[PDB]
RNA sequence: AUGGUGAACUAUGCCUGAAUAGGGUGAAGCCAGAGGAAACUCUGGUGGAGGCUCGUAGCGGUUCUGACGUGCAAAUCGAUC
RNA sequence: UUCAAAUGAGAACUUUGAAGACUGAAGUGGGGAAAGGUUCCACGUCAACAGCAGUUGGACGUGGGUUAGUCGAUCCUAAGAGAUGGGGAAGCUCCGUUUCAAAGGCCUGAUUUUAUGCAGGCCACCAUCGAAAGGGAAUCCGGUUAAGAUUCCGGAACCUGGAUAUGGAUUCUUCACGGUAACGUAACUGAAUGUGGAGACGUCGGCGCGAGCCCUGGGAGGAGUUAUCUUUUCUUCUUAACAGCUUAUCACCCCGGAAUUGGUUUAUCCGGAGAUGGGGUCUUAUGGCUGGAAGAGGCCAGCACCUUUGCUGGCUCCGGUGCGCUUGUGACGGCCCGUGAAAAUCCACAGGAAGGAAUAGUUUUCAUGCCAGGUCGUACUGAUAACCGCAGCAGGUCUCCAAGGUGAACAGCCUCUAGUUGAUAGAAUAAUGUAGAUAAGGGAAGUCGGCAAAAUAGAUCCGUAACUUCGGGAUAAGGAUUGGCUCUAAGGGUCGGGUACGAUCAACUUAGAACUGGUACGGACAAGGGGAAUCUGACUGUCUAAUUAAAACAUAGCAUUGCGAUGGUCAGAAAGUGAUGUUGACGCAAU
């Protein structure tokens, strides 16, 4: 039969990200000479909504060390940072909400955000609204630092990898019921074309592994193997358990 | 001729009415009219001394 | 004259969606539309303007905050944590 | 189409000229065999397709 | 009763196709097309419409004398006076306080 | 387009290198509330715009017309 | 089977434009007032909320299993919706 | 639809006159976008074509007709398209678009062999196509044609480029003064570089103001009606872009220093971070008066004469009103897990390289002056006949302007302006039909089934159950009232009052009381049937264009799965390829 929906997604025709209104990509400062020997100061000049994103952006501007001009950056605003605030960035920066520092220079327990996966990658970890990473240890020989990501995962990255002190703004966005179809409508209208969702169990066999039959039903385990092939992977991929989760979760 | 007789109150009974009382003349229009009149009577009384600013100020919020 | 025994702002949804959802919405609505205190100048004039953004009418500071409330519990504890942790570093 | 390209107007003009009956003097030529213009077009019977 | 027609080919009601009805000396109603409204220039520091300064559409400023584009203070047509009080005050004290910091830590480097 | 009201400035106009042609119009008009009177507009046509001076006094009117440059090609009415 | 041509219909996304009588309802916020030992409770206004409602244009196409059914028409017409 | 005339061999059907109607400003009116392509217009004219006709035509024949510095295109950028160094591919070619690239051009100085070599310092921005609705330099009125006109003619402007002289301003304190200040101005030097603004932005609600329209008094005119009545009915009384002065909610400055808290919006917001008060500053939307400009246009009267067609007179004035209508705009307010383009282009500021006077310099962001503005489109239709449906097809096809009454109303019904009066025709009125109505008594007995039809309906007042997520259910149900005329009562504005009232002008709203009629009155139009339950989907929403609109799909809500980027899911023949990704677990993907 036909190419199913989740395969058509990849050719990104009607499926590319709706991008027109976006502020620009959020990114730490390029890791230059200032930030890795000293600190450099900026002013947050505006904190601002970014369509499709949930957390507001901070627009923060710095002087240029090598040329007379301003260079502006787009940060993701940590909660509590504000317009006119001075933002300090560098190895020898001080430990306050809003500043950006290398995880090597912060005590364990430090609560950071937008952290780099490798030094210089201008930020990758915990950027969504409300999210953060905790520093839970250091290993000064072979300078690594060990952190706990929002997913629960613990991971060890370079101590020069940078992050910004505090948590990302907009927390609890998801506490509030969407209430109606229409609010989801406008939600995804500014993201990508993933809404609404026909159940494969409502299609015909041409369309889906789940399609067809004189009652609606999956007709075979919907836990599909990792090694399955395109066209096959619909449902609980690689599922190592299944069913209502009883009892406390949380990584021991 | 007809307009005249309306100026004279004719042709305005219940049998001649098809919009709601409110569609005919809004409650809110009535209110604003009224409230502007109280409001600017206070202003002139104050500005004459006929009333004292203290009494005015209570009258305002009462109005 | 009390207009509603309990739906409050949530009366705009009529009978739809189910009382429970309307409850949850009620709580965060009241939060987000509320007027808050401004730390910098002291007048209670901080109103929201899109999730996470909190600006002051007078004086004009804008502070990144919670999706529906100026300060988030998590934010707040984190703040004092940082207070605490930094304290060690000069001491 | 009320606000046209030269290219289209140019074609239009070439079409205006081609719209005439056979020049009768041709009928009288030795061995002449053309009775009538067999390629006459009319705006309300056959469209130009530009 | 006298009705009216657009005067350019554009039939649609777009921002660039605003119309105003007018009585001519012929004693008839006629459409006139209307350019979009100019907005007031704004202050670099605060953002308020800055007083003193004419408001035209941008190219219309190169048609108009220099004095429609300034007030006669420092940062004239650019920042909004109060914003420049602030600038002067802030400059001064900080340049002053800089003298202060130097001589204080000069004493720290001589007494310790 | 323009209007002029300094009698002195006007004579200065009427002799400018481009000012070739000019005209005098006469208007019957009423005075205050009562009677009427004789208004006269002096229009010099300079190159880029048309200056026009309204002398409201029939007296000043006559004498002004004599001062009119004897090469100016005045259109009377 | 091989190689080509179509998104002028239509499905969906994107960019840029445009359009939508008149009514009914009366949500937050706000003013004044009344009771009560207290906690607190009531009344009148104001305001103008909603994938709210009556209903045109719009968009749709429910019933007559109406018209037509060698048609006005290879899907239309009328009433009702 | 009708009478008559004219024309013609011929007239139900052409032209003109008369009459009767219609569309009824949500148009059968006045223009446009796509599309057509001469259909426009004149003259001639009927073989075919316009399912009767034809003297008529969107037909046939022959001609005429589309005028721009300012209206568009052209320029800019949007989704996106797409060259180039390159990398894949046997290859047609695929990828990538600033990429693993030695990616280029400006300002003036150096020349006084001379024409443009090198001397500085920059600037590293690295194609290009992509909007006749987005952005955007500048034009208006009157007249004129068989058919063009914001395009010609008349008159009056404005922009852009280029030239430049004269005046003014500035300077011996060189690069202006004034004002405490907001800031004023006719000017008032300013390279590199930097920075700021404008361009530039959602939606709804009430309120305020402008414009045009609507209603209306006086007056000066023309028309209509006049047995009777009407100081009456209809109509004309207009003012462009542009320019001078003036004009504003907002905002801001100076004085001052606030509890007895004041000020204040319809809407509760503001003040020791300086209110209220007084006095000033600013934007010029918009309006006023004047210039343009009465010479125009509009309406009349009085003579002239086959003619081109004139000639001469007058008058074109002063006001009122508002929850009116449409549109514009402002100050605000609601809303969002939605916060509602970009670029060209224009200005400003910070900076201070440089250049510049007293025996005479500086100045074209002040005034006035001179020259030039190419190229293509411009006719007409835009639809019950100019487009698409084989056609002059009851279908389909984006849009602006919008008068009076009734009435809540852009509804229906009647009307003014404009436009139509086209659709084969005549004679009869059998059956059976289609479409529109009515029926005594009974009242669903008809039928699978109340299918069809009938009943109900507006507004004011009264009255309103179960149950409920407390929001509803609800116009629940159920009732009364409603015309005409004639009265009373309540609801407002503007003014002067030493430091209690008076006088005046202008609006339907609501309630009550008489009188009155064949008991009628939402009098046509317009306008909900209601109730009790079972099954079923929560709801609003969605689909089988053309036999299924549903209980099917969606949805919010609930729950499960995968994944920390050297990744999950997915694309590709391959790749220095691609979607999610301007992304990062409050995330993306999969059920
Ligand atoms: Mg993309
Ligand atoms: Mg979709
Ligand atoms: Mg689904
Ligand atoms: Mg699903
Ligand atoms: Mg199915
Ligand atoms: Mg299958
Ligand atoms: Mg399977
Ligand atoms: Mg199945
Ligand atoms: Mg199932
Ligand atoms: Mg009300
Ligand atoms: Mg009002
Ligand atoms: Mg008043
Ligand atoms: Mg008060
Ligand atoms: Mg056709
Ligand atoms: Mg064809
Ligand atoms: Mg036109
Ligand atoms: Mg000015
Ligand atoms: Mg100025
Ligand atoms: Mg200076
Ligand atoms: Mg299409
Ligand atoms: Mg709009
Ligand atoms: Mg409406
Ligand atoms: Mg109603
Ligand atoms: Mg409505
Ligand atoms: Mg008490
Ligand atoms: Mg409403
Ligand atoms: Mg609805
Ligand atoms: Mg409804
Ligand atoms: Mg209705
Ligand atoms: Mg309908
Ligand atoms: Mg319809
Ligand atoms: Mg629909
Ligand atoms: Mg039908
Ligand atoms: Mg049928
Ligand atoms: Mg039949
Ligand atoms: Mg006939
Ligand atoms: Mg009639
Ligand atoms: Mg009619
Ligand atoms: Mg109508
Ligand atoms: Mg017709
Ligand atoms: Mg036309
Ligand atoms: Mg055509
Ligand atoms: Mg014709
Ligand atoms: Mg014939
Ligand atoms: Mg034909
Ligand atoms: Mg025929
Ligand atoms: Mg015939
Ligand atoms: Mg011909
Ligand atoms: Mg011809
Ligand atoms: Mg133009
Ligand atoms: Mg060009
Ligand atoms: Mg390519
Ligand atoms: Mg282009
Ligand atoms: Mg364009
Ligand atoms: Mg355009
Ligand atoms: Mg004309
Ligand atoms: Mg001509
Ligand atoms: Mg024409
Ligand atoms: Mg001309
Ligand atoms: Mg001229
Ligand atoms: Mg010039
Ligand atoms: Mg001066
Ligand atoms: Mg700029
Ligand atoms: Mg900007
Ligand atoms: Mg735009
Ligand atoms: Mg203009
Ligand atoms: Mg004042
Ligand atoms: Mg003063
Ligand atoms: Mg409209
Ligand atoms: Mg906004
Ligand atoms: Mg400017
Ligand atoms: Mg030098
Ligand atoms: Mg100049
Ligand atoms: Mg035309
Ligand atoms: Mg036609
Ligand atoms: Mg048709
Ligand atoms: Mg017509
Ligand atoms: Mg027929
Ligand atoms: Mg017959
Ligand atoms: Mg019967
Ligand atoms: Mg009965
Ligand atoms: Mg039975
Ligand atoms: Mg029975
Ligand atoms: Mg039976
Ligand atoms: Mg049955
Ligand atoms: Mg049965
Ligand atoms: Mg029925
Ligand atoms: Mg009956
Ligand atoms: Mg019920
Ligand atoms: Mg009565
Ligand atoms: Mg009275
Ligand atoms: Mg009175
Ligand atoms: Mg059953
Ligand atoms: Mg349903
Ligand atoms: Mg539904
Ligand atoms: Mg079907
Ligand atoms: Mg089929
Ligand atoms: Mg349905
Ligand atoms: Mg159907
Ligand atoms: Mg459930
Ligand atoms: Mg390779
Ligand atoms: Zn504040």
UniProtKB/Swiss-Prot annotation, chain A:
Record localization: Cytoplasm
Keyword Cytoplasm applies: yes
Keywords, sorted A to Z: Cytoplasm, Isopeptide bond, Phosphoprotein, Ribonucleoprotein, Ribosomal protein, RNA-binding, rRNA-binding, Ubl conjugation
Cross-link entry Glycyl lysine isopeptide (Lys-Gly) (interchain with G-Cter in ubiquitin), positions: 45, 92, 118, 144
Broad class of the protein's primary localization: cytoplasm
SUPFAM superfamilies: Nucleic acid-binding proteins, Translation proteins SH3-like domain
InterPro entries assigned: NA-bd_OB-fold, Rib_uL2_dom2, Ribosomal_uL2, Ribosomal_uL2_C, Ribosomal_uL2_CS, Ribosomal_uL2_dom3, Ribosomal_uL2_RNA-bd_dom, Translation_prot_SH3-like_sf
Pfam families documented for this protein: Ribosomal_L2, Ribosomal_L2_C
Gene Ontology process terms (BP): cytoplasmic translation; maintenance of translational fidelity; ribosomal large subunit biogenesis
One MF term in the entry's GO annotations: RNA binding
GO CC terms, sorted: cytosol; cytosolic large ribosomal subunit
Modified residues (Phosphoserine): 51, 94, 158-159, 248
Protein family per UniProt: Belongs to the universal ribosomal protein uL2 family.
Purpose: Component of the ribosome, a large ribonucleoprotein complex responsible for the synthesis of proteins in the cell. The small ribosomal subunit (SSU) binds messenger RNAs (mRNAs) and translates the encoded message by selecting cognate aminoacyl-transfer RNA (tRNA) molecules. The large subunit (LSU) contains the ribosomal catalytic site termed the peptidyl transferase center (PTC), which catalyzes the formation of peptide bonds, thereby polymerizing the amino acids delivered by tRNAs into a polypeptide chain.
Other facts: There are 2 genes for uL2 in yeast.
Protein name: Large ribosomal subunit protein uL2A
From Swiss-Prot, chain C:
Coiled coil: none
Predominant location: cytoplasm
Molecular function terms, GO-annotated: structural constituent of ribosome; zinc ion binding
Transmembrane as UniProt keyword: no
Residues modified to Phosphoserine: 39
Alphabetical GO biological process terms: cytoplasmic translation
Cellular component aspect of the GO annotation: cytosol; cytosolic large ribosomal subunit
Subcellular location: Cytoplasm
ZnF C4-type span: 38-59
Pfam families found in the cross-reference section: Ribosomal_L37ae (PF01780)
Keywords of the record: Cytoplasm, Metal-binding, Phosphoprotein, Ribonucleoprotein, Ribosomal protein, Zinc, Zinc-finger
InterPro entries per UniProt: Ribosomal_eL37/eL43, Ribosomal_eL43, Ribosomal_protein_eL43, Ribosomal_zn-bd
Superkingdom of origin: Eukaryota
Function: Component of the ribosome, a large ribonucleoprotein complex responsible for the synthesis of proteins in the cell. The small ribosomal subunit (SSU) binds messenger RNAs (mRNAs) and translates the encoded message by selecting cognate aminoacyl-transfer RNA (tRNA) molecules. The large subunit (LSU) contains the ribosomal catalytic site termed the peptidyl transferase center (PTC), which catalyzes the formation of peptide bonds, thereby polymerizing the amino acids delivered by tRNAs into a polypeptide chain.
Subunit and interaction comment: Component of the large ribosomal subunit (LSU). Mature yeast ribosomes consist of a small (40S) and a large (60S) subunit. The 40S small subunit contains 1 molecule of ribosomal RNA (18S rRNA) and 33 different proteins (encoded by 57 genes). The large 60S subunit contains 3 rRNA molecules (25S, 5.8S and 5S rRNA) and 46 different proteins (encoded by 81 genes).
UniProtKB/Swiss-Prot annotation, chain D:
Entries under InterPro entries matching the protein: Ribosomal_eL39, Ribosomal_eL39_CS, Ribosomal_eL39_dom_sf
Annotated Basic residues bias: 6-19
Protein's GO biological process: cytoplasmic translation
GO molecular function, one term: structural constituent of ribosome
A Pfam short name: Ribosomal_L39
Keyword presence, Ribonucleoprotein: yes
Example of a GO cellular component annotation carried by this entry: cytosol
Signal peptide start and end residues: none
Residues covered by region (Disordered): 1-21
UniProt-annotated location(s): Cytoplasm
Keywords in alphabetical order: Cytoplasm, Ribonucleoprotein, Ribosomal protein
Domain of life the protein comes from: Eukaryota
HAMAP family to which the protein is assigned, alphabetical: Ribosomal_eL39
Function comment: Component of the ribosome, a large ribonucleoprotein complex responsible for the synthesis of proteins in the cell. The small ribosomal subunit (SSU) binds messenger RNAs (mRNAs) and translates the encoded message by selecting cognate aminoacyl-transfer RNA (tRNA) molecules. The large subunit (LSU) contains the ribosomal catalytic site termed the peptidyl transferase center (PTC), which catalyzes the formation of peptide bonds, thereby polymerizing the amino acids delivered by tRNAs into a polypeptide chain.
Assembly behavior: Component of the large ribosomal subunit (LSU). Mature yeast ribosomes consist of a small (40S) and a large (60S) subunit. The 40S small subunit contains 1 molecule of ribosomal RNA (18S rRNA) and 33 different proteins (encoded by 57 genes). The large 60S subunit contains 3 rRNA molecules (25S, 5.8S and 5S rRNA) and 46 different proteins (encoded by 81 genes). eL39 interacts with YIH1.
Family, similarity comment: Belongs to the eukaryotic ribosomal protein eL39 family.
Descriptive protein name: Large ribosomal subunit protein eL39
Gene this protein is translated from: RPL39
Curated annotation (Swiss-Prot), chain F:
Alphabetized UniProt keyword annotations: Cytoplasm, Ribonucleoprotein, Ribosomal protein
Origin organism lineage: Eukaryota, Fungi, Dikarya, Ascomycota, Saccharomycotina
Gene3D superfamilies per the UniProt record, alphabetical: 3.30.720.90
Cellular-component GO terms for this entry: cytoplasm; cytosol; cytosolic large ribosomal subunit
Top-level taxon of origin: Eukaryota
Matches recorded under PANTHER family: 60S RIBOSOMAL PROTEIN L38, LARGE RIBOSOMAL SUBUNIT PROTEIN EL38
Family to which the UniProt record says this protein belongs: Belongs to the eukaryotic ribosomal protein eL38 family.
Cell location: Cytoplasm
Biological process according to GO: cytoplasmic translation; protein-RNA complex assembly
Record's subunit section: Component of the large ribosomal subunit (LSU). Mature yeast ribosomes consist of a small (40S) and a large (60S) subunit. The 40S small subunit contains 1 molecule of ribosomal RNA (18S rRNA) and 33 different proteins (encoded by 57 genes). The large 60S subunit contains 3 rRNA molecules (25S, 5.8S and 5S rRNA) and 46 different proteins (encoded by 81 genes).
Coiled-coil residue windows: none
Miscellaneous remark of the record: Present with 50200 molecules/cell in log phase SD medium.
Main location: cytoplasm
UniProt name for this protein: Large ribosomal subunit protein eL38
Molecular function via GO: structural constituent of ribosome
């Amino acid at each position: 039969g036909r190419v199913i929906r989740n395969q058509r997604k990849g050719a990104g025709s009607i499926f590319t990200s709706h991008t027109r209104l976006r502020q620009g990509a959020a990114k730490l400062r390029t890791l230059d000479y200032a930030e890795r020997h000293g600190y450099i100061r900026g002013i947050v000049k505006q904190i601002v909504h970014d369509s499709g994103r949930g957390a507001p952006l901070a627009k923060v501007v710095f002087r240029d060390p090598y040329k007379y001009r301003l260079r502006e950056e787009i940060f993701i605003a940590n909660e509590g940072v504000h317009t006119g605030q001075f933002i300090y960035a560098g190895k020898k920066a001080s430990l306050n909400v809003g500043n950006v520092l290398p995880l090597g220079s912060v005590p364990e327990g430090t609560i950071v955000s937008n952290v780099e996966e490798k030094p210089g990658d201008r930020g990758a970890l915990a950027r969504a609204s409300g999210n953060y990473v905790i520093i839970i240890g250091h290993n000064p020989d072979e300078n690594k630092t060990r952190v706990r990501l929002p997913s629960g995962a613990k991971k060890v990255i370079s101590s020069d990898a940078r992050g910004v002190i505090g948590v990302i703004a907009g927390g609890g966005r998801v506490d509030k019921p969407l209430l109606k179809a229409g609010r989801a409508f406008h939600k995804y209208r500014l993201k990508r074309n993933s809404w609404p969702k026909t159940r494969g169990v409502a299609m015909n066999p041409v369309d889906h592994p789940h399609g067809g039959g004189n009652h609606q039903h999956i007709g075979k385990a919907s836990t599909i193997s990792r090694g399955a092939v395109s066209g096959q992977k619909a449902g609980l991929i690689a599922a190592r358990r299944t069913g209502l989760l009883r009892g406390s979760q949380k990584t021991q | 001729a007809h307009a005249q007789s309306k100026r004279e109150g004719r042709h305005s009974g219940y049998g001649k009415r098809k919009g709601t009382r409110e569609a005919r003349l809004p409650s809110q229009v009535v209110w604003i009219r009224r409230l502007r009149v109280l409001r600017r009577l206070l202003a002139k009384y104050r500005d004459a001394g006929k009333i004292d600013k203290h009494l005015y100020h209570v009258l305002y919020k009462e109005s | 004259a009390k207009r509603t025994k309990k739906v409050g702002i949530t009366g705009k949804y009529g009978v739809r969606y189910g009382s429970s959802l309307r409850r949850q919405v009620k709580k965060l609505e009241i939060q987000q539309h509320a007027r808050y205190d401004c730390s910098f100048c002291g007048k209670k004039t901080v109103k929201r303007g899109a999730a996470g953004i909190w600006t002051c009418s007078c004086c004009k500071k804008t502070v990144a905050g919670g999706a529906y409330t100026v300060s988030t519990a998590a934010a707040a504890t984190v703040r004092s944590t940082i207070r605490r942790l930094r304290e060690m570093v000069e001491a | 189409a009320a606000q046209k390209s030269f290219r289209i107007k140019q074609k239009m003009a070439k079409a205006k000229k081609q719209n005439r009956p056979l020049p009768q003097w041709i009928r009288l030529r030795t061995n002449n065999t053309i009775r009538y213009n067999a390629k006459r077009r009319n705006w309300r019977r056959t469209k130009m397709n530009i | 009763a006298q009705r009216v027609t657009f005067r350019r080919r554009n039939p649609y009601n777009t921002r660039s196709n605003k119309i105003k009805v007018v009585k001519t000396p012929g004693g008839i109603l006629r459409a006139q097309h209307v350019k979009k409204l100019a907005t007031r220039p704004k202050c670099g520091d605060c953002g308020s419409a800055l007083q003193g300064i004419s408001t035209l559409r941008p190219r219309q400023y190169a048609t108009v004398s220099k004095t429609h584009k300034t007030v006669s203070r420092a940062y004239g047509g650019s920042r909004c006076a109060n914003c420049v009080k602030e600038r002067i005050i802030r400059a001064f004290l900080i340049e002053e306080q800089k003298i202060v910091k130097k001589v204080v830590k000069e004493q720290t480097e001589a007494a310790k | 387009a323009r209007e002029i009201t300094d009698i002195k400035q006007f004579l200065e106009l009427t002799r400018r290198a481009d000012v070739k042609t000019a005209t005098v119009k006469i208007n019957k008009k009423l005075n205050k509330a009562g009677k009427p009177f004789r208004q006269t507009k002096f229009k010099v046509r300079g190159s880029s715009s048309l200056y026009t001076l309204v002398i409201n006094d029939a007296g000043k009117a006559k004498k002004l017309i004599q001062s009119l440059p004897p090469t100016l090609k005045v259109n009377r009415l």
